[PDB]
Every structure is written in structure tokens, then in C-alpha cells.
């Protein structure tokens, strides 16, 4: 399959490298430093598995359409990234987002009806230009957005699985994007404001209790929007924590490193969607403000 | 007036010092370290004003009943304080709480019917034993609890004003206690979680906005309980932030000392009352949990 990865950072590099190793026609689109490193010395994966590949790399999407465009930029980059890559979206090109946050698939739908949504629990970190840590193995779920099925989604899933990307197909992609966002709202909210490891959210019984309330808040918004869940967000929440007990969440890591966070597309979107249908998401709103305020305080 | 200040922390020390300077017969009842410092080197106030006075100080309640007993301890110690002082609560002794939070007056009423509720928006910090930083010059309002009037309440307000404690009398003290509780829910919640001075909550427009939402939540709970306000809690909020903008709030101070915090008596009380009338108080509930979580994380550590 011809695949362009738009956003050759941590998760984009991991997916691109695995897809390339399996023999797919892969092009990574990203930062100059990343492109130059890869073109010079290839792309190195270490951690859960160790190997080197040399996919194509460029700072700008080719005009030639791929079978698949994977969106792997941060959510605050999606709108512009699509504007800068629209030349490659052909009549038959599908766009898959494996991004956290909400609304990315909607942005892609502006350009084509051929959109899939995805969630991955793989963990990755680009530690140097051209060197990505496969920090943890996990499942990937993809589906026609917002719901239903398509032969090409099935193909993508097979390609993924053959490359060692464990992948399941869902006919409720939107449910999964929202379930992930709700889980992120709890972990990336509480863990960041308190600066604690994910496991602490379960160990302090009061944090465990408020986690449920935050999750229920997101679930109720979803339900009012007509969204249903294939897997319960609460189940996903506790499973996610159980597996990442000693980790600091990615939002907290962003702030520590002086990088922009994605909370506008997590808490922010839950809040915005709630308002549109006559609800509030007060806990999400407070977490949103606290995390953004913490960021401003640190920056300055 | 013969006045015993029960609790020799920052606010108790500030009130005791001001009342002593004015010539009142003042005794501070508190912990050994503070008591010893006051008896040895006097009580020194600095910041908003700078002066030194030497009130009496003791770890034990005097036998003689005072005209006025001022509760100034943190709210988690109100029961301990009243037990320490129970023998000096005479038939004509009034107890005034100027404490943060809700419910302190109700605890005092278990000992005597002579209870007044008080709010003060002064900001203070005990920086060394015997040395209090007056970080924000606020206002004080006192009244017969929960409502109504009494000649002695008026007399106390007169004494306070004479001593430079700017004070008004209210016939709706319970409403004032709730207004201050709502103000503290914003300041001691947001300021503590973010670990910033009070002024930052007004400076950041996004914090400003969420502050309104938190205040409204508390006001709606109060309305359901039949509480009426003489002063808009939002006005009290902005006034208080301006008057104490350089202060780190008392809850944050406790966190930094690895102490227990008062939040059970602020956010916790708002949430508990809310739930009793079928209301969530979601913002207060989250702040409650966040601050108590920080309390537990920092407990026993001095930062
Ligand atoms: S019953 C009579 C005999 N006394 C006893 O048996 C002991 C129990 N009774 C008492 O301690 C006092 O009678 C009461 C009034 C209950 C408490 O006295 P204080 O109010 O003076 O003492 P506190 O500990 O409650 O707080 C006073 C200030 O001291 C500072 N502070 C307390 N704890 C710490 C720690 N761990 N580290 C640094 N500083 C600490 C605080 O600044 C506190 O002032 P705040 O303004 O509240 O912060
Ligand atoms: N890392 C993980 O383990 C993981 C796992 C699951 C999901 N996710 C989600 O996947 C998404 C990406 O995460 P990430 O950790 O991989 O972020 P990342 O390391 O910052 O990688 C994103 C890359 O895309 C680049 N980029 C931005 N705009 C671009 C554009 N027009 N063209 C080309 N490149 C562009 C970015 O560069 P600049 O920074 O300079 O803009 C960055 O290098 C997020 O939504 C994340 O939540 C990540
Ligand atoms: C008035 C104010 C908010 C001063 O900070 C206070 O009551 C406190 O610190 O608890």
C-alpha cells in the first residue's frame, strides 16, 4: 500500500517505520530535522522492538495521491497540516486519524468523504531525530468515520496487522474517539493539575471517585449527541491506568518540556459540544482552565 | 474590653495585636511556640502596617470569663479550641468566630447562646513565631448568629473600629458567612491548586471567568438553602482579591507547611449542603478533591 504519514513525530514515526519494514510504499512528512536525519541515516526503532528502515521523507506532501494518508500531527496542527497537504488527497485516497482529541476526522471530512477514525494504545517517543522509542505495545482500533464499514478500512487493517500493528475494525469509530477523549480528559486533566503518575488517580480513593464523575460528565455529553459506546469509557479508563501506573501523562510531559498541549481538543471540545446541545461539562471546563493556566504560569 | 483570642495563628495574632494596641485587655490562647515568642519578644506586625505590642499569651484558658472570646483557629481545630476554653465561657461571655468556612458558629452554639458570626477579608501570614505579615488590609463584618441584633454585638463592632479593625454590623450574619465561603471557594481553591498569589486570579482573564462560574455555583446552593445575601458574593470576591492580591491564601499556606487544610469546611460544606438538596456542586467538588489530594501529597512535608 502507498501510505503517507502526515506528522513524522513520535507515533507517526513508529507507524511509518513498521509499515515500511513490512514493505509498504511509505513516505513520512514532517520537520526538516526529522526528514534530513531519516534521508541520511534512516529511521531507527528501539525499545519493544529494534530495527532500522529507510522510508522516503519530505517536508511537503507530494501531489501524487497515496492509498492512505495517516494524520499523526498534534490536534492543534491538524487544520493547517491538511491545508498544506491537500494536494495529495486523491479521489480514492482515504484519510485516517490516529490522533488524540476530538474533531480531527471532521477536519479531514472537509476534503474527502473517505475518512477513517482511529485510536492506538501503542506508546512512542521520538528521542532523537531519526530515532523513535517503541515504549509500549498496545491495540489499535480503526473504522469508517463516524460509523459503519468499508472494504478499504478492512484492507488497511490487514496491512496494519501484517506489519505488526495489532488492529481491530470497529463500526463505531466515533464512539471510540469519544471514549478515548473521555479517558484522556480524566488522566491528562487530573494527572497534570496534581503532577502525579497515572496510578495515583486510582490509589487515592477520592481521585478515583472524582475520576468517575469526570468520565460520567463526558459520557452524558456524548449520549446527548447521539453517540454510543462499544467499550465503556470507565472500563477503558481503569484498564488504561492499570497499564500505565508509573507513567506521567503526555499533557504533563508537554508542559514540563515547554510544548503546547492538546487539551483544547480534549476538555475544550467536550465543553464546546456540551454547550451546543444545552449542557455544561463543568469539571471538564475547570480542568481545561487549570491546565491552560498552569501552562501560562510556567511559560512565563 | 477583656478579650481572649482563641487561636494564635496569623489572623488571631493580627486581631489580638490590633486590639492590644488600642488598649484592650487582650490574652492570646494558642500553641507553646507562639505563646513563648509573644511573652518573650512581644507580637510584631509588619507589611500593611508595622508595629509591636505585648498582649498576654498562654497555652491554658484563663479562669476569668472574658467579655469576648474570638475563635480564630483553623476550622479543623474548632472543637479542640472550644474544649480548651470551655471553662472560661461565662454566662455573659460572647463567642465570635472570624474563621474561614461554615459551621463554626453552630459548634460554638453548643456551648452558649451568645454567638456572633464574623467575616474578615484581611490576609495574613505567620512568618516566624511572634511575627505576623499583614499582607492584605481587608474589611470585617460581624453579627448575632445566625440573624438579628444585640447591643453587645454593636459594642464589639465599636471596639473593633476604635482599634482600626474596619467593621460593620449585619443582621444577616449567616448570609455573610456564606458569601465569604463562596469567596474562599474561589480563592482558596484556584489559588491553592495553581500555587499563586490571590491577585493572579483576577489578572488572568480565563481564571477570572471560571471564578464567576464557581461563585455562581455556590450562590445557587445558598439560594436553595434559603440563604439571603446583603452583599453580592461576586463583589466581595473582586474586592477581596484586590485587597489581598499580594497574599498567598491560607489554604495554600497550609499545603506549603504540609499541614491539614480547611477545605472540608469550605468546599466540603458547600458540596454537602448542595447534595442535601439534590444538587451537584461539581466545581466545588472537584476543587475539594484536588486540594485534599494536594494536602495528602504534601502532608508532613515543609516546602
Ligand atoms: S487545652 C489547653 C492546653 N493545650 C493543649 O492541650 C493543646 C491543644 N490546644 C491548642 O493547641 C490551642 O489551645 C489551640 C487554640 C487549639 C491552637 O492554638 P494555635 O491556633 O495557636 O496553634 P495552631 O497549631 O493551630 O496554629 C497556629 C499557627 O502556628 C503555625 N503552624 C501550625 N502548625 C505548623 C507547622 N507544622 N509548621 C509550621 N507552622 C505551623 C501556623 O502558622 C498557624 O497559623 P496559621 O495562620 O493558621 O497558618
Ligand atoms: N506519542 C504517542 O505515543 C501517541 C500515542 C497515541 C496517540 N498519540 C496522538 O498522535 C498525535 C501525535 O502525537 P505525537 O506524540 O507523535 O506528537 P509529535 O511528536 O509532536 O509529532 C507530531 C509531528 O508532526 C509535525 N508537524 C506539525 N505540523 C506539520 C505539518 N504541516 N507537516 C508536517 N509535519 C508537521 C510536528 O512538528 P512540530 O512540533 O514542529 O509542529 C511533529 O513533528 C497526537 O494527537 C497524540 O495525542 C500519540
Ligand atoms: C481573605 C483571604 C482570602 C485572604 O487570602 C482568606 O480568607 C484566606 O486566606 O483564607
CATH number at residue A242: 1.10.1040.10
Task: Report H helices in chain A.
Answer: 10-21, 32-41, 78-85, 104-109, 151-162, 173-194, 200-203, 205-224, 233-243, 250-257, 267-276, 282-299
| B114 touches B92 (CB < 8 A) | yes
The residue contributing the CA closest to ligand 2 atom 37 is: A31
Is B177 contained in some domain? Answer: yes
**A110 and A41 in a common domain:** yes
State whether A200 and A261 are in the same domain. yes
- Using the structure block, give the residue that is written with the C-alpha cell 487582650: B26
Separation CA B74–CA B12 (nearest Å): 10
A12: which residues sit within 8 A by CB, 6+ positions away? A5, A6, A28, A30, A70, A72, A73
DSSP secondary structure code for residue A97 in this structure? E
The B68-71 sheet, strands edge to edge: B56-58, B25-29, B2-6, B68-71, B94-97, B115-120, B140-144, B167-169
Question: Which residue in the block uniquely carries the three cell numbers 482599634?
Answer: B163
Using CA atoms in the order A46, A52, A57, A63, what is the torsion angle rounded to 10 degrees? -110
Q: Which of A204, A282, A293 sits opposite B282 (nearest CB)?
A: A282
CA of B9 to the centre of ligand 1 (A): 7
Answer whether A96's CB lies under 8 Å from A70's CB. yes
CA-based max dimension of chain B: 54
Tell me which chain A residue has its CA closest to the CA of residue B285. A210
Dihedral angle, C-alpha A183, A188, A193, A199, nearest 10 °: 70
Helices (H), B96-204: 104-108, 151-162, 173-194, 200-203
- Final residue in a domain of this structure, among A113, A143, A171: A171
A67 in the same domain as A86? yes
Beta bridge partners of B254: none
A56 and A153, same structural domain? yes
CA B265, CA B257: separation in Å to the nearest integer? Answer: 19
Convert B257-290 into a string of H (helix), E (strand) and C (coil). CCCCCCHHHCHHHHHHHHHHCCCCCHHHHHHHHH
Put simply, the answer to whether B204 touches A296 (Cβ < 8 Å) is yes
User: Which of these three, B171, B196, B212, is where a domain ends?
Assistant: B171
How are strands ordered across the β-sheet holding B43-47? Answer: B51-53, B43-47, B131-136, B123-128
- Within this chain, do residues B61 and B113 fall inside the same structural domain, yes or no? yes
Resolution rounded to one decimal, in angstroms: 1.6
Report CA torsion sign: B36, B39, B41, B42.
Answer: positive
**Ligand nearest to the Cα of A81, by number:** 2
The ligand with the least distance to the CA atom of A123 is 2
Distance from C-alpha of A107 to C-alpha of A84, rounded to nearest angstrom: 13
Give dist(CA A291, CA A269) in Å, integer: 14
8 A C-beta contact, residue B16 and residue B55? yes
- If you measure CA to CA, which chain B residue comes closest to A217? B282
> Which residues of chain A approach chain B closer than 8 Å at the C-beta?
190, 193-194, 196, 204, 206-207, 209-210, 213-214, 217, 282-283, 285-287, 289-290, 292-294, 296-297
Same domain as B244, residue B267: yes
The boundaries of the domain holding residue A16 are 1-171
Which of A171, A205, A230 is a domain's end point? Answer: A171
Contact B293 A207 (CB under 8 A): yes
Do residues A96 and A118 lie in contact, with contact meaning Cβ atoms separated by under 8 Å?
yes
Torsions phi, psi for B27 (to 5 deg): -125, 130
Residues from chain A contacting residue B286 (CB–CB below 8 Å): 210, 213-214, 282-283, 286-287
Q: Are residues A251 and A269 in the same domain?
A: yes
Contact A27, A54 (CB under 8 A): no
Contacts of A100 by beta carbon, 8 Å cutoff, 6+ apart: A75, A180, A181, A184, A250, A262, A265, A266
What's the rounded Cα separation, in Å, for the pair A93 and A42?
26
Whether the CB-CB separation of B67 and B96 falls below 8 Å is answered with no
| B147 shares a domain with B92 | yes
Does B265 lie in the same domain as B184? yes
Q: Do A289 and B210 touch (CB under 8 A)?
A: yes
Check which CATH number belongs to the domain holding A80 and give it.
Answer: 3.40.50.720
**In this structure, are A144 and A188 located in the same domain?**
no
Number of domains in chain B: 2
Same domain, B274 and B132: no
Q: A202 an active-site residue?
A: no
Q: Is there a single domain that holds both residue B21 and residue B106? A: yes
Q: State the nearest Cα–Cα gap between B184 and chain A, in angstroms.
A: 16
| Residue A62 DSSP symbol | -
How does DSSP classify residue B291? H
List Cα–Cα distances, B212 to A7, A270, A294, B120, B144, in angstroms: 39, 20, 19, 21, 29
| Choice among B177, B180, B197, B269 that is catalytic | B180
Nearest-angstrom CA–CA distance, B288 and B272: 11
Amino acid at each position: 500500500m502507498r501510505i503517507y504519514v502526515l506528522g513524522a513525530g513520535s507515533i507517526g514515526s513508529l507507524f511509518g517505520a513498521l509499515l515500511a519494514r513490512a514493505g509498504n510504499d511509505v513516505t513520512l512528512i514532517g520537520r526538516r530535522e526529522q526528514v534530513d536525519a531519516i534521508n541520511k541515516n534512516g529511521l531507527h526503532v528501539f525499545g519493544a522492538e529494534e530495527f532500522t528502515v529507510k522510508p522516503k521523507a519530505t517536508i511537503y506532501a507530494p501531489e501524487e495521491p497515496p492509498d492512505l494518508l495517516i494524520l499523526a500531527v498534534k490536534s492543534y496542527s491538524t487544520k493547517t497540516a491538511l491545508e498544506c497537504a491537500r494536494q495529495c488527497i486523491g479521489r480514492n485516497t482515504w484519510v485516517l486519524s490516529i490522533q488524540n482529541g476530538l474533531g480531527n476526522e471532521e477536519l479531514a471530512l472537509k476534503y474527502t468523504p473517505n475518512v477513517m477514525g482511529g485510536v492506538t494504545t501503542n506508546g512512542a517517543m521520538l528521542v532523537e531525530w531519526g530515532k523513535v522509542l517503541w515504549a509500549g505495545k498496545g491495540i489499535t482500533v480503526i473504522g469508517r468515520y463516524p460509523t459503519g464499514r468499508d472494504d478499504f478500512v478492512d484492507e488497511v487493517a490487514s496491512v496494519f496487522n501484517e506489519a505488526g500493528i495489532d488492529t481491530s475494525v470497529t463500526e463505531n469509530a466515533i464512539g471510540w474517539k469519544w471514549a478515548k477523549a473521555i479517558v484522556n480528559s480524566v488522566i491528562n486533566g487530573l494527572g497534570t493539575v496534581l503532577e502525579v503518575k497515572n496510578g495515583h488517580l486510582k490509589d487515592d480513593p477520592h481521585l478515583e471517585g472524582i475520576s468517575v464523575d469526570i468520565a460520567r460528565e463526558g459520557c452524558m455529553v456524548a449520549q446527548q449527541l447521539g453517540i454510543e459506546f462499544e467499550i465503556h469509557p470507565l472500563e477503558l479508563l481503569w484498564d488504561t491506568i492499570e497499564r500505565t501506573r508509573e507513567n506521567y501523562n503526555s499533557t504533563l510531559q508537554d508542559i514540563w518540556r515547554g510544548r503546547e498541549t492538546e487539551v483544547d481538543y480534549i476538555h475544550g471540545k467536550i465543553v464546546e459540544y456540551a454547550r451546543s446541545v444545552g449542557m455544561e461539562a463543568p469539571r471538564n471546563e475547570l480542568l481545561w482552565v487549570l491546565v491552560k493556566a498552569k501552562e501560562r504560569i510556567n511559560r512565563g
